[PDB]
Amino acid sequence: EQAVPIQPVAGAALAAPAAGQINQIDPWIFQNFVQCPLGEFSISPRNTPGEILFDLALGPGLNPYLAHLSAMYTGWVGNMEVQLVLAGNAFTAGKVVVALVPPYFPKGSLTTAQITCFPHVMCDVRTLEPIQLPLLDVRRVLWHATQDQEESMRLVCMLYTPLRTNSPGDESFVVSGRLLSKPAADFNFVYLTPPIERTIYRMVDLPVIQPRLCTHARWPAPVYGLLVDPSLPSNPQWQNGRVHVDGTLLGTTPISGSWVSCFAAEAAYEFQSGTGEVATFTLIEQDGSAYVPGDRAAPLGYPDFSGQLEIEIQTETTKTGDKLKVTTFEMILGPTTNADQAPYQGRVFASVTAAASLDLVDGRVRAVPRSIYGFQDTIPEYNDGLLVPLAPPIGPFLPGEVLLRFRTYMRQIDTADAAAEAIDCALPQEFVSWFASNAFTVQSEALLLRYRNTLTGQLLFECKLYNEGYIALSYSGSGPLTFPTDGIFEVVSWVPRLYQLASV
Amino acid sequence: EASGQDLVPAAVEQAVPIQPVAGAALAAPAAGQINQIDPWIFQNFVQCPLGEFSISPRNTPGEILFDLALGPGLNPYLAHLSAMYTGWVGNMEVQLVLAGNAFTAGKVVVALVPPYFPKGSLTTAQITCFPHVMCDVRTLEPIQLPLLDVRRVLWHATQDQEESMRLVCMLYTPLRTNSPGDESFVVSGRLLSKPAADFNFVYLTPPIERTIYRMVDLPVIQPRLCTHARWPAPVYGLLVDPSLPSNPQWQNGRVHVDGTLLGTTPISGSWVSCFAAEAAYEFQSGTGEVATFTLIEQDGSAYVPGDRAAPLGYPDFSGQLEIEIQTETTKTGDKLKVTTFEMILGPTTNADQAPYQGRVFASVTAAASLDLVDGRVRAVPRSIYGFQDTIPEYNDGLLVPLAPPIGPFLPGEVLLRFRTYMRQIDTADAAAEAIDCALPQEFVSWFASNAFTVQSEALLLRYRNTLTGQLLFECKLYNEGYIALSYSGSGPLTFPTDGIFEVVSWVPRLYQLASV
Amino acid sequence: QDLVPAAVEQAVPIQPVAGAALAAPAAGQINQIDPWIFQNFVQCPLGEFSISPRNTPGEILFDLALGPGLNPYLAHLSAMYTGWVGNMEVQLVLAGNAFTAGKVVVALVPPYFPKGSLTTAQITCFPHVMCDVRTLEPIQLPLLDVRRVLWHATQDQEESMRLVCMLYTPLRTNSPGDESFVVSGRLLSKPAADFNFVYLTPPIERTIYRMVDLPVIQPRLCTHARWPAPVYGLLVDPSLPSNPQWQNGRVHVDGTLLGTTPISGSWVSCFAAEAAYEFQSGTGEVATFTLIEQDGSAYVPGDRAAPLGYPDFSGQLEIEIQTETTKTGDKLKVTTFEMILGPTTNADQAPYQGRVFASVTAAASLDLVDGRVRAVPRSIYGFQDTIPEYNDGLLVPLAPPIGPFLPGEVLLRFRTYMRQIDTADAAAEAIDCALPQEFVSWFASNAFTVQSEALLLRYRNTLTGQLLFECKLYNEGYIALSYSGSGPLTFPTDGIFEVVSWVPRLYQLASVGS
Ligand SMILES: C[C@H](CCC(=O)NCC(=O)O)[C@H]1CC[C@H]2[C@@H]3[C@H](O)C[C@@H]4C[C@H](O)CC[C@]4(C)[C@H]3CC[C@]12C
Ligand SMILES: C[C@H](CCC(=O)NCC(=O)O)[C@H]1CC[C@H]2[C@@H]3[C@H](O)C[C@@H]4C[C@H](O)CC[C@]4(C)[C@H]3CC[C@]12C
Ligand SMILES: C[C@H](CCC(=O)NCC(=O)O)[C@H]1CC[C@H]2[C@@H]3[C@H](O)C[C@@H]4C[C@H](O)CC[C@]4(C)[C@H]3CC[C@]12C
């Protein structure tokens, strides 16, 4: 190892009296260096001193073996050993500082003038052998708990003295550094309990379902292909199909795939001597519950696209030539208002253009959409002309990155062309349901996906799934680019935000 | 020693896989004082305040017989001493007493759940993974277990609830009997506990009587001197009746044992079925004199419709009710005069009325107009006609917050009633409903002004007669605010009103009471 | 045979508590301090308390928490370490006369005691020392460290053994009274023999236990927090209502901004919006504004009453707007617009919902197009100090009124004059604010930790060194003064403020008058 101004720290010699058991580990784990997650960095000549290369906290998450073994235990104590590996030839200059931050330290930005005060080591970029460091366990309690995120001593590495090298015309230069770790000879678990599957250290996975069979979240119709292009606005404001990875729903996205673009309301029918009878709908949640205004722009499943739409609402007739019928009503959701539709307050109006006043009975009807007229990709009038709370627009994106859109086609009334519409969304419905049900634990920033074919095994492209619930690609073209609907998404690992993908 | 030993007792085999744990040898140099417990406490086993359980053939595998959290709440000596100190460490010894008959069969498991384990199901498949001990319901000698203390801090705090090692016992194999005749035995098991050799408190604090542990106690007064919680009259009888509906929705005399009040139960005893309002009078050549009431609470506060169905003390029955009111008259000679007004409950028209909306109508027959003035009055009941013990409408036809119906009950359990039937010749009622309630007003006041802390689910009470000093029965008091007892009869059963209720111990919901 | 004396000195018996002997095998380092701190008593940051005959038995005079915040040397040294273990000692002095009679108690409440209420019959059960008001010599007490964790953390307040004193016997004077005699009392503290920090750390300057300071700026060269004009007066007046509900110039001492207060001094009373214009048939040019934040960020309704910087006073406002025109002869013009904010109800005003309507009488027609513009106030008509129509006619979340002044206490006001449009009277209106600009600033730029309830200030001249008055600054961000007159009183503006210490809620100021 290396000399560091710190005292030896006791491990299991302190927690033995106050713990029921002390459990050993397989001895073949103390002899292997396994890469820690998020333990990679790349230094480039354009970087400036003071950039935080990486930081990570001591725990059972620094080793897949320990992270898996910590499901049937309760606590853990002890120190670990860490190895830093740098790639660089003998025509390089620069220096990097590696420190040992104490646990209870304020969270903020560290300038290069402050990082050196901690017990630290200084490493050149020309170093040949890997650099070894200890990672003790400084605490105030006898042992930690495996199901709680406590405070533990961290490791922070930041660039100290910048890099000076020449560069060819193709790949300028990148000094790559990687981190490995292993438990020391003083690591022990505490109490044996029956295994728990839904633990905190669970890698995120995705359902094995091809995109051709998914269900769109903005309109009840199957997905008919996915694509990416820069023509459309970079930051839309869709209120359906938004979800966090951790399992919290934003906007007005419903849990099931049948509530989309449909609403439940109590109806009141009153004949009007002009166009026809007029129905006023007081909205109510689909499951059946009082609707009160809040942070949601509308009741769950309400449409989030502007245009002219019609629905079927299971009419009833008290006249004697029949008892129950279904006929098409009329709805207006486009811009320019000219109506008194207040979904936020729970009040909608509908009408049918027909004479010979009908006989109707109010029957707390449902509603299912049929088709649209004049689709516009803007939000509708949630209030009269006021502002209502809503989800933030999708963004921001790294330069040269573009959103991936799942696309479907609508039914049209236009008398000019019948090509497409075509409605886009960020995620299909089953992904939303999966993320809502499982409720994973987000680790750092984002996931690295891979859209590989099932049979041949060749890889199509690499995409990044941000924590906010959208997928971005490193595309630098000019025209629309579609993709096949056969491959299966996979999860690679967590990556930092400032990660550069492979261009497609 | 004992008689024929065709039984098991060989407990011996504990062999629990756990290391010894240091007690007060750790917290000694981090506490400001020195303390010790009376050495005669460490010597004799005594019953825990939650040391009663019963195994019955109606149970199924997977039912949690009992659970215990390590602390001062497992010993009356330590429970009493916990009000004078702050913090505790150490282990305990627990004796479990099962003495089932020689005709029974079954097996139970005792586990040692570690701290921080999530609370919830704990099915039968998981209980054996912890360090566990097998037991038979036919063992003779008491079974001894150690209850150690596993922690990470030096000492816990007596106030609030920390996380410490638990003891959970669940029925593994169902209990059945081979007795040839007519019945299946129910095994009653007891618990005892004493501090280990290294128990100690930490810091001295003023003795505050209102402690988190404490122990629920009942007022020592006979039910015959109580006052009813639904009508201004004394309690006249104690009744059990299976014929009448067993899940009412009464809105008075309902109060949690931890202090919270539900429904429209007033704290005082004179607020029942009485209401204060602002009243405006007028004359109609039909009904006579009609008066509009806007109600407010009796103290003098304003009314705002909240999570309560009606102002506190409002009646919660149906029928025609006649009240006595005080009015001031303009004409000479008579200036103050008492009158008898009357109103019905359900007239349903565009006159609901809506006590939820603070609006009420009253009418009195009078051919000649009475010169009356606007005023503020208080109304107290005088007579009833056509009384139905069903919840009346409060709003127009909408839904209003309401207390949940009294329940649920175990099979064979019946709800006790503080009730009076006095036989009488009725005029218009074919279903004679007489006066009833669930608890008297004294109990409501006691529970509201004491604010106890519940422990598991319910209390075990015994109704002991005071003249001769023999028990009459035992009942289960659910901490939701009602009393139940086992009864499988057909007709009503009445009880004397000379006993005084006692409190024995806490108990879970699935306790099987003795028949009566 | 024995002898039991009837006069024994007061003492508190203690059992030694291990300090670094426990945290050594689980802390990275154990750092000692200068060995000449253990030999001197220093005033604590919270070291002021006062006893008055207005008090009643059973009142909590003061309470302190064991930690590095009880000594200026330790408060300074704590900026470069992480943990600490050990005990201290606290000395108490009272400035009592030979006429006042009374007794107080000092008790060492242990940690995790339910922080409810204490009666006079309970405080005496803890290890306690009984003090008389008439004592001359200071009295000292120890303060052990009773804990369950190995070593505390500086950045977390946590729970530690307290020291709370309370009035035992009511204070009474042989004089007829009621008088204004108050007994002052001060505290000092010093580390015991077993104190040391834990981990070494680069010295940060923005941390807890950092003494609050104020900018050295005379009020003449400051800026009003409710109008773009310099401060023109400093005054106190009891005729006006003593519980205003201004929505501007409100900031906590810690840095939490309350209401619609903007950080900069140039955002006040002015806003920015996307504006659409439309002509009429006699009304004139009617312009509809959708409000946005001054920096261009979108506005979303929330718990804030209105967009930042919106005016919160009733009346008719004349504003200046930059527009671009269509007809030839000119391109860009500046136009005067009218705005209605008071409870007129003859309009559709909802700054909460981000809709604003403005009008001008006419010039000729003046066809102008939509544009993103910024509105700055120019003139005011019909001033009434009442909250305007934030919603149409409904309610809106608002900052609470000031409160809760003790009896005999009033609020200090900073007075700034207006630009008035009037026909009858030539008097100039004035606006009172609780704090000026550069005082809402210098807050939310520093993470000050309150650590107590009230902060005691002091006003004095620069070149004369003469005290003018003492004022109490509450946590919520207003200045309280002890005045008992009838008419308004103004003060010279050339003085400067300076912090003194932290004082509890029940501190009694010194009466001022003329
Ligand atoms: C008459 C309709 C059923 C047929 C219909 O109109 N649509 C069915 C379809 O097309 O899927 C009735 C059947 C059950 C009714 C629902 C259920 O009773 C539950 C619920 C009850 C609330 O009071 C009103 C909404 C809500 C949600 C009701 C809306 C109307 C429903 C859906
Ligand atoms: C002068 C009247 C007495 C009227 C009276 O004799 N009423 C008898 C009756 O209600 O029948 C006084 C006696 C008690 C007073 C009330 C109590 O003293 C206090 C109460 C609460 C507030 O302090 C003020 C209102 C309110 C509600 C008081 C209103 C005026 C009352 C009602
Ligand atoms: C209010 C000011 C115009 C100022 C002016 O000419 N007269 C008003 C005054 O003097 O205050 C508006 C007009 C144009 C606006 C800009 C543009 O409309 C848009 C532009 C977008 C950038 O991303 C950031 C803001 C930025 C840069 C805007 C800042 C505010 C500006 C500069």
Numbering used by the authors:
A (entry chain C): 27 to 530
B (entry chain B): 15 to 530
C (entry chain A): 19 to 532
Which statements did the authors publish about this structure?
The T=3 icosahedral calicivirus capsid is composed of 180 copies of VP1 with a molecular weight of ~58 kDa, which is divided into the N-terminus (N), the shell (S) and the C-terminal protruding (P) domain (1–5). The S domain forms a shell around the viral RNA genome, while the P domains form protrusions emanating from the shell comprising A/B and C/C dimers. The P domain is further subdivided into P1 and P2 subdomains, with the latter containing the binding sites for cellular receptors and neutralizing antibodies. At conditions found in the gut (i.e., low pH with high metal ion and bile salt concentrations), the P domain rotates and drops onto the shell with intra P domain changes that enhance receptor interactions while blocking antibody binding.
